[PDB]
Amino acid sequence: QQPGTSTPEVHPKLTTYKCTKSGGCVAQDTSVVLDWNYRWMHDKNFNSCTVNGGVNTTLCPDEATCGANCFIEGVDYAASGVTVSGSSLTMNQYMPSSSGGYSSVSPRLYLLGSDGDYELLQLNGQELSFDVDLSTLPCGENGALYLSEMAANGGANQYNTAGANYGSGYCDAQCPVQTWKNGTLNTNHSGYCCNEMDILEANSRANAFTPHSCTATACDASGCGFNPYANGFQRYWGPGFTLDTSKVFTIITQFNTDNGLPSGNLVSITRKYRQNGVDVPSAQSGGDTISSCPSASAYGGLTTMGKALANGMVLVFSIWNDNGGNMNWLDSGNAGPCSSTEGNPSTIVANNPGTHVIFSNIRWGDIGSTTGG
Ligand SMILES: *[C@@H]1O[C@H](CO)[C@@H](O[C@@H]2O[C@H](CO)[C@@H](O[C@@H]3O[C@H](CO)[C@@H](O)[C@H](O)[C@@H]3O)[C@H](O)[C@H]2NC(C)=O)[C@H](O)[C@H]1NC(C)=O
Numbered sequence: 001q002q003p004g005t006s007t008p009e010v011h012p013k014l015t016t017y018k019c020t021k022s023g024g025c026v027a028q029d030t031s032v033v034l035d036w037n038y039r040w041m042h043d044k045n046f047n048s049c050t051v052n053g054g055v056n057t058t059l060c061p062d063e064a065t066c067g068a069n070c071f072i073e074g075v076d077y078a079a080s081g082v083t084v085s086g087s088s089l090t091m092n093q094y095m096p097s098s099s100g101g102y103s104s105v106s107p108r109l110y111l112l113g114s115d116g117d118y119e120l121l122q123l124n125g126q127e128l129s130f131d132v133d134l135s136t137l138p139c140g141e142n143g144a145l146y147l148s149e150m151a152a153n154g155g156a157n158q159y160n161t162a163g164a165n166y167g168s169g170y171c172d173a174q175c176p177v178q179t180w181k182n183g184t185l186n187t188n189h190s191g192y193c194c195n196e197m198d199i200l201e202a203n204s205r206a207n208a209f210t211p212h213s214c215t216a217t218a219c220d221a222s223g224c225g226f227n228p229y230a231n232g233f234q235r236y237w238g239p240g241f242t243l244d245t246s247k248v249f250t251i252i253t254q255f256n257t258d259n260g261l262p263s264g265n266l267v268s269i270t271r272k273y274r275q276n277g278v279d280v281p282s283a284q285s286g287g288d289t290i291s292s293c294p295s296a297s298a299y300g301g302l303t304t305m306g307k308a309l310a311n312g313m314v315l316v317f318s319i320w321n322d323n324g325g326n327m328n329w330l331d332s333g334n335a336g337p338c339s340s341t342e343g344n345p346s347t348i349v350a351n352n353p354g355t356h357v358i359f360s361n362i363r364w365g366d367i368g369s370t371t372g373g
Pocket residue numbers: 043047048051056057058059
């Protein structure tokens with residue numbers, strides 16, 4: 001909980017822009033930081049403080065004790081699957097193993113600001129657009145760009161001076177019990193819930209954008225997702241399809257409010273695509289929009305999402321697969337064209353190692369002001 005001196009932590013800078021209707025786009029000095037749990041933490045004598053996703057009780061009985069004795073280290077970002085250049089960020093599901101195979105480095109990054117706190121994105125009544133390359137992501141792979149209402153300082157406190165510069169304080173709508181819940185040891189082994197907007201969870205075969213609203217207590221773990229295949233338009237998204245996933249494309253997510261201003265109440269989430277210089281038509285007539293969100297209705301639904309988006313959330317980038325489900329909920333069944341088995345990590349690392357997602361040209365701001373005439 002003090003920054004280690006062995007591996008200096010240098011955050012790779014990723015060029016992002018905030019855009020106004022009248023003032024145009026202004027560049028931000030944003031970087032990316034890899035998640036807390038991916039890091040090695042040790043003693044002053046190089047005895048580790050972590051052991052198997054759980055602290056080493058000999059060294060962290062206390063949180064005061066653990067603040068004093070422990071030092072969390074920097075990261076080889078290229079080794080971790082992360083490579084960055086200009087506005088572009090490439091994330092690799094796998095990296096070569098010295099022992100001959102492929103290690104499954106599964107990066108989770110956050111958008112960090114100049115001050116060393118997370119760059120909070122206020123998106124109620126606002127839009128966020130980026131370009132993506134998911135051509136090399138097959139079934140069962142999750143290239144993900146989302147937001148979470150995590151603390152901007154990552155939860156840093158008197159006993160944790162590392163904080164967001166080391167990816168501290170992750171939370172999501174699945175309320176995960178982290179070994180450090182918001183910057184401090186989870187002695188209680190509690191779960192950390194917070195509102196989570198998923199802009200993209202996708203591969204070249206299927207995709208979904210999901211809002212998950214939360215009370216302070218709990219979350220709508222499975223939100224009111226929007227998958228075009230699952231809504232009937234099965235040959236809309238895919239290689240060669242209306243939106244060609246084999247080439248780069250542009251994703252615009254628009255958070256529409258009743259009064260038109262960030263001050264208002266969130267009433268819809270509209271998704272628009274552009275590729276090959278042209279607006280790609282919506283799957284459903286009159287727009288790919290989320291108005292109704294029944295699942296969230298026990299959590300003040302879709303309105304509380306707008307309040308968290310208005311407060312400002314943390315930008316998260318990720319790529320992963322699950323050994324349990326094969327991501328079948330995303331790309332299989334009536335949600336996509338993949339087999340129940342096809343999505344299994346075994347088949348992936350065999351057939352598509354170095355499957356990777358490329359996020360680029362992230363911009364956010366006034367609606368209509370982030371895309372280009
Ligand atoms: C929790 O952390 C404890 C304490 O940092 C770790 O235990 C330590 O492990 C190292 C290496 O296994 C021991 O090193 C040896 O120390 C003795 C005397 O220092 C020396 O004669 C040896 O040549 C070697 O340097 C160290 O003593 C030991 N310390 C204690 C207090 O047990 C440990 O890795 C963690 N616990 C678990 C269960 O993993």
